[PDB]
Subunit: 56 residues, 2 copies
């Protein structure tokens, strides 16, 4: 429909610095920040997606 | 599928200024603007999403 999304295209970033803004993956883990989230979302291939913004 | 989305990643913004562009959350409330929407979308953890662009 409409949605509220994270863009992960220009990830993975080897080096990247990121207040504190966590995410909560499919997996029920709280991803520190977006660079933590979207890299693992590439190194996951499919078995990670965003269950929501914030901590779990 | 395809969708028309709002990116909330680099929220919450403590200070932020935002014409007038409302959103309409899951909850059937009209969120003044995007900074109003995406902060509450973090401080909601999951129980807020976008039902559509515009006022309700």
């Amino acid at each position: 429909l409409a949605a509220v999304s994270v863009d992960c295209s220009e990830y993975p970033k080897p080096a990247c610095t990121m207040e504190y803004r966590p995410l909560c993956g499919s997996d029920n883990k709280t991803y520190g920040n977006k660079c933590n989230f979207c890299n693992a979302v590439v190194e996951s291939n499919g078995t990670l997606t965003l269950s929501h913004f914030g901590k779990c």
